[PDB]
């Protein structure tokens, strides 16, 4: 509700192939606070994460170590009546 | 209009000729009402979805931009030179 919204964090992660995408997904889905994650975008490299209390610092560091050169695209709150 | 003359208008990005964003409406959260499209020198970079009557921080090339949306999905922010993010209301919303 208003004041208690989920986080929305979108990364751009240049992906070699579907194997990088699978790894991104498993990593994000095993991260504390994450509710759900999707990959889409024009290059299938937009990683949309939603959740609560996600430590984006540690998440982006892990993606950079394990997947590829992740960049922040967006940080926002989910609009929820 | 005699032969050999030329005429054009200014080249305003036309969202009606843009393919939809490759979006995924996450079933756990409210469906966002807007599409956004990011351009540099009129060349599409990427596209996505966002909420109407709302706000977000988005990385637009070399600069963070604080993007506000109105109820019709018009997007405002201090975009870096040559960049823009344009919104449209999704069909049915």
From Swiss-Prot, chain A:
Top-rank taxon: Eukaryota
Residue span of region HMA-like domain: 8-81
Domain HMA: 6-75
Tissue distribution of the protein: Constitutively expressed.
Induction data: By M.oryzae pathogen infection.
Oligomeric and partner information: Interacts with AVR-Pik through its N-terminal part containing the HMA-like domain.
Family listed: Belongs to the disease resistance NB-LRR family.
Reported function: Disease resistance (R) protein that specifically recognizes the AVR-Pik effector avirulence protein from M.oryzae. Resistance proteins guard the plant against pathogens that contain an appropriate avirulence protein via an indirect interaction with this avirulence protein. That triggers a defense system including the hypersensitive response, which restricts the pathogen growth. Contribution of Pikm-2 is required to recognize the effector avirulence protein AVR-Pik.
Domain note: The HMA-like (RATX1) domain is responsible for the specific recognition of AVR effectors.
Protein's name in the database: Disease resistance protein Pikm1-TS
Portion held of the full protein: 186 to 264 of 1143
